Design an enzyme around this catalytic site. Sequence first.
Site, short mmCIF file in Angstrom:
data_model
loop_
_atom_site.label_atom_id
_atom_site.label_comp_id
_atom_site.label_asym_id
_atom_site.label_seq_id
_atom_site.Cartn_x
_atom_site.Cartn_y
_atom_site.Cartn_z
N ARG A 1 0.83 -1.19 0.00
CA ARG A 1 0.00 0.00 0.00
C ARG A 1 0.87 1.25 0.00
NH1 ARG A 1 -1.35 -3.56 3.56
NH2 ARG A 1 -3.27 -4.79 3.37
N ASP B 1 -17.96 -4.48 -1.88
CA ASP B 1 -16.89 -5.46 -1.76
C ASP B 1 -17.54 -6.80 -1.41
OD1 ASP B 1 -17.55 -5.13 0.92
OD2 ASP B 1 -15.47 -4.84 1.60
N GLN C 1 -26.68 2.28 3.22
CA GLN C 1 -25.69 1.22 3.25
C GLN C 1 -24.85 1.31 4.53
OE1 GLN C 1 -21.70 -0.43 1.03
NE2 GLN C 1 -22.06 1.63 1.81
N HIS D 1 -17.85 -8.07 1.48
CA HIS D 1 -18.65 -7.89 2.69
C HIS D 1 -20.07 -7.46 2.33
N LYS E 1 -14.32 0.06 -5.63
CA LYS E 1 -14.70 0.02 -4.23
C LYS E 1 -14.17 1.26 -3.51
CE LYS E 1 -14.60 -0.66 0.19
NZ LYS E 1 -13.61 -1.65 0.71
#
Length: 311
Positions: free
Chosen positions: A195, A259, A301, A261, A240
């Site tokens: 990252r 995603d 959401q 999830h 995402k």
Amino acid sequence: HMRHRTLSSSPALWASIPCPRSELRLDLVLASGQSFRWKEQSPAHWSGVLADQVWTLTQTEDQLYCTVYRGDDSQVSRPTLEELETLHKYFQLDVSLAQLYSHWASVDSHFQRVAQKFQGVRLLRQDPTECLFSFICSSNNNIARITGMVERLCQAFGPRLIQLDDVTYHGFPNLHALAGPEAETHLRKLGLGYRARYVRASAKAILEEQGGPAWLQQLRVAPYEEAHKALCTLPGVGAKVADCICLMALDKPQAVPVDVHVWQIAHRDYGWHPKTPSPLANKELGNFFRNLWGPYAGWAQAVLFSADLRQ
Ligand SMILES: Nc1nc(NC2CCCCC2)c2c[nH]nc2n1
Ligand code: NI
């Protein structure tokens, strides 16, 4: 020398904002995967840094209490009018959440049941930069480890603000600080791993390719779909992460970040299957929720995601 304030300890330096519990719950918002800069240092008291200043937030049934730490070796005081406007905008308190809850509830029986227990889950209006690089750190990660990465990154690259107890508070670094030739190597030492590459690369990209932080301000006024595509040109930023930024920093309330999830929830709780995981299927699921909930589908959401964390 300097300590974390409580409402009992030093109530002289606090100021209130009229805010019902059903409009906002700090404990369902501040550490529910939106911002990674808030910590409940003492019970019911959330401290964090916001616009190169430190805040402590606590609430009652009908009131939201807040105090500030400037930290410039200056005379302490209550939050000013302009500082309270910043917090008003941050929580987007001009938008009624109660009316939104009932709106979503009318066309969703599942939301109705979850909305019983979990009231006051709303979307924060974050700084684009802070949001961008925070969500680049979010890939294949969890709230605990992300919080650490962001804290360390701010310590290394961001300017010091103040110390309270044993917590040294740093503001979020500018793009230039993250674009430097050593930046990736340092970020890897701080434990970001792969990252680190995307962070430096994206900071460097926004500077040279897009012309600095004004670009992100442009996206904030651009239409959702235009902003999304522009973000997806950045290293380490896909659909995402782009949706997260759109929803949380660029005022796109219809942005529904998908995603695995969200797939899990969608499938288990709505029985959703792709008519037409994959990029194509994820896009259909975002369309599904927008079709169902409407132009604040991203806010709905958040209620489910926040509710799904807390058992
Ligand atoms: N760390 C993190 N955060 C998320 N954000 C959710 C809460 C706020 C509204 C959007 C959804 C994530 C969604 N999927 N994976 C996530 N990870
Ligand atoms: Ni099935």
